[PDB]
Every structure is written in C-alpha cells, then in structure tokens.
C-alpha cells in the first residue's frame, strides 16, 4: 500500500502501543525506496526502539539471575538456554534494522541531519549487538558501532549547532558507548560534559519545540555524569 | 519439559515480563493433567491477564479513536476487527483450558471458585467487544460463571478469603460495566467489604497481604462510583 495508508496505520499502532505492527508498517515504508521525512524517521525510531527494548530488558533480567546463582546446576542450563533464545531474537531485530540502514536509509540520505540520524541508529543497534556478543563477534560489533558513532559525531560537529537535539542525543549515546562498551568512564564523562557545556553556551538562541528535547537530553547528560561520577 | 522445570521457566519469563512465553508454559503445565497450587494458579492468571490486557487496551484506544472519526474510519474499523480477533483467540484458549482441564478436575471449592471467577472474567472480556446475540450469550455465560462462583464461595468460604473478595470485586465490576447498574455493583462491593470487616479478627496472616489490597480496591471502586 502507498505511503499514506502505511503512515496512518503505523501512527494508529503507536497510539495503541502495538509496536510490532508499527515496525512492520515503517519497514514497508522504508523499503518502498523513497527518502523518509522527520515524521517517518521518528516513527521508525520509536517503533524499533520499542520492539528491541523488551528483548533488552528481558535479557538483562535473565542475565542478572544467571550470574546471581550457583554454578554447575541443571537449573542453570535452562536459564542459559532461555537467555540464548532472547539473544537470538534480539540479534534478528538488530539485523533487520541494520539491513534497513545499509540498503536504503543511509545510502540515499541527502541532508546531513538524516545522515547523522541514521549513523546514530547504526551505532545504537550495533551497540545492542555488542552488549550480547562474545569474542570476535563482539570485536566486530564494537568496531562497527564506534565507526558509525564517530562518523555521525564528525558530521554533527561540522553541520549542527551544539544545541541541536539530534547532536545532543548522539553525544549522550556515544558517551554511553564509551562507558558501557569500552569501559572508559573518563572519556564517556568528557564527551557527555563537552556536549553539555557547548550546548549551554548557545541555549538562549533556540526554538521552544527544540527547547523541550534539548533540555531533556542535557538533563539526561547531567544525570549520566552524576551516575558515572559515583 | 517437566512440570517443575516448566513452572521454573514460567517464573523466569514472568520476571522478564515475557508473558507470551509464561502463558505457553502455564498452558503446557495445565494440559499435563495435574492440578495447580495457589502460586501456580496465580502464574496462569497473571500470564493470560497480561497477554489479553495488552489487546484490551489496544481495542479501547482504537474504538475511542473510531468514535471521534472517511477511508480513515474504514482502516480504523479493520484494525479494531484484527485486535478483536486476537482477543477472541486468547479468550477461547483460556476458556478451553478452564472447561477441559482446570474446572473439571478441581479438588477444592476454592479452586473451583477461582476457575469460575476466571471464566466469568474472560467471558466478560469477550462481551466487551461483542454485538448482537453473541453479546447476549457471552454476558449470559459471564454472569452464570460469576454467580456460581459467588454461591459456592459464600457456601464454603469465609468473607475474608482473598479469592472470595476478588470474586466480589470483579463481579461488581461486571454489574457496573456490562449490565450497567451502579447501585447493584455498589451494593455487591460494599456487602463484600462489610462482611470481611465483620470478622477480620479471624483472618490468618498468610492472606493479610492479598485480602487487605483487594479490600482497598473494593473501597476504591465504591469511591469511583459515588462521584
């Protein structure tokens, strides 16, 4: 079906919180071949973040239960197999998103905003793969994540003001990549705080619609800094 | 998989909020043939409640959007019908489990009351989206299940028992929501609440948690229905 109907259906799913159907709609929209608007990129991002977050949370809970129990037990093998199931379907989701990014979105992105956005999504989901990968697959996923983040970070430094909410979300997630993946608290803190300060300087010159998002993201940067400092 | 391992996986999925897996685990346990402890009955109830309530909320959202609304309206109605189909599938699964395995082979009056309450619940969920004679019959079945559970509970259980209280709560909601009489729903909730308070000094500690909460809910309904 043409874009209009898919967008209506995806938005109705978002209202009903049927994120699987929303994701299907937006995958169809993307695969139609044409470039997406900001509305459509937000729909895609929201949908897939929602379908992947449930698997991420389940995995985190299951793995906290796995390491919180005694070894060499039959009870433990069931938990590990369940963790492997959730890992498998999370990897399938991430692979879907990354395929959409490699075949359609990034390639045909025409403006630097969309490039930053899609490269940030690439980094996010390769990071999601890294948080569940091992050994060489882990090295691969981390390298790809960091490369995408770095390309977006450079494009953003060169094309966006330090107040643009996309640039600030990129900085937030990239510092989180530094702290959680690379295990570098100092550089995570530095990246996040630099984004913060450079944003605060130019804040008075900014749009209310962007003010909400930007001040939210800056507040999140400050909270991450407080957590990482402790 | 074996019952013990099965309910282990059920608790695991529960803590992971993977309610579809939890529901399939508990369906397998039930279809094994043996009866369920109070904790396992709770597992099954929670699992299927989550899976059906996702779709209940979706259906309410969509029907609301439809009321305020056009090709748009056609798409809205088709999507609502999809959600309704999923809801009917889930409810039929639960009701089939109740008829074949759970209600039939129940040992205690308390388990029978629990399963009858659950049957009332899911026929009520089916009636929330019914039209015509199907609506009449689903309301009939829900009320019949609730009334049988109510009669058995007041015959064999004390007013303070949490199962009896939960039955009163959901049966009062059925009166207020499906049949549409605030006075009778209020009277049911209030008679349950007051009867529980009358004893209370007899209630044992195991139930302190459940009963208390349920009673609060009763009072909450009575507050929401007096405004």
């Amino acid at each position: 079906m043409e874009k209009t109907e898919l967008i209506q259906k995806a938005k109705l799913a978002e209202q009903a919180e049927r994120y699987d159907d929303m994701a299907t709609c937006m995958k169809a929209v993307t695969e139609q071949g044409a470039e997406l608007s900001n509305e459509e990129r937000n729909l895609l991002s929201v949908a897939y973040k929602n379908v992947v977050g449930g698997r991420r949370s389940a995995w985190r809970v299951i793995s906290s239960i796995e390491q919180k129990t005694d070894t060499s037990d039959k009870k433990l093998q069931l938990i590990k197999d369940y963790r492997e199931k959730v890992e498998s379907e999370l990897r399938s989701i991430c692979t879907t998103v990354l395929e959409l990014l490699d075949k359609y979105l990034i390639a045909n992105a025409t403006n630097p905003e969309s490039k930053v956005f899609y490269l940030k999504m690439k980094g996010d989901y390769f990071r999601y793969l890294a948080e569940v990968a091992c050994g060489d697959d882990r090295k691969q996923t981390i390298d790809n994540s960091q490369g995408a983040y770095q390309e977006a970070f450079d494009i953003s430094k060169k094309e966006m003001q330090p107040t643009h909410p996309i640039r600030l979300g990129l900085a937030l997630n990239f510092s989180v990549f530094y702290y959680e993946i690379l295990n570098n608290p100092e550089l995570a803190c530095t990246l996040a705080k630099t984004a913060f300060d450079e944003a605060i300087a130019e804040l008075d010159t900014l749009n209310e619609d962007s003010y909400k998002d930007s001040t939210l993201i800056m507040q999140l940067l400050r909270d991450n800094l407080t957590l990482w400092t402790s | 998989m074996e019952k013990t391992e099965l309910i282990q996986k059920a608790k695991l999925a529960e803590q992971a909020e993977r309610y579809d897996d939890m529901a399939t685990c508990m369906k397998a346990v039930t279809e094994q043939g043996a009866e369920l402890s109070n904790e396992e009955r709770n597992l099954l109830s929670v699992a299927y409640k989550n899976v059906v309530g996702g779709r209940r909320s979706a259906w309410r959202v969509i029907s609301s959007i439809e009321q305020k609304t056009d090709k748009k309206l056609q798409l809205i109605k088709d999507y609502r019908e999809k959600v309704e189909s999923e809801l009917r599938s889930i409810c039929t699964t639960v009701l089939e489990l109740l008829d074949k395995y759970l209600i039939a082979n129940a040992t205690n009056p308390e388990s029978k009351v629990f399963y009858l309450k659950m049957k009332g619940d899911y026929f009520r969920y089916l009636a929330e989206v019914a039209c015509g004679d199907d609506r009449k019959q689903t309301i009939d079945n829900s009320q019949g299940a609730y009334q049988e559970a109510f009669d058995i509970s007041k015959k064999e259980m004390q007013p303070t028992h949490p199962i009896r209280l939960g039955l009163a709560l959901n049966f009062s909601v059925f009166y207020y929501e499906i049949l549409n009489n605030p006075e009778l729903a209020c009277t049911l909730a209030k008679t349950a609440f007051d009867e529980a308070i009358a004893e209370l000094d007899t209630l044992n500690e195991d139930s302190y948690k459940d009963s208390t909460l349920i009673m609060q809910l009763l009072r909450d309904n009575l507050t929401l229905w007096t405004s």
């Binding site: - | 709560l169 349920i214 309904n221």
Partner: peptide, 18 residues
C-alpha cells in the same frame, strides 16, 4: 476504569521505550 484482579504490569540513552 474500575479495579479488577489480576492487574497488568543503567545509563540513560535516547530514544527510550514507552
């Protein structure tokens, strides 16, 4: 709505699930 039983149910990044 009226109450009934039973009821349904790190670093910060964006976006976040609802």
């Amino acid at each position: 709505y009226s109450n009934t039983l039973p009821v349904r149910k790190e670093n910060k990044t964006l976006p976040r699930s609802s």
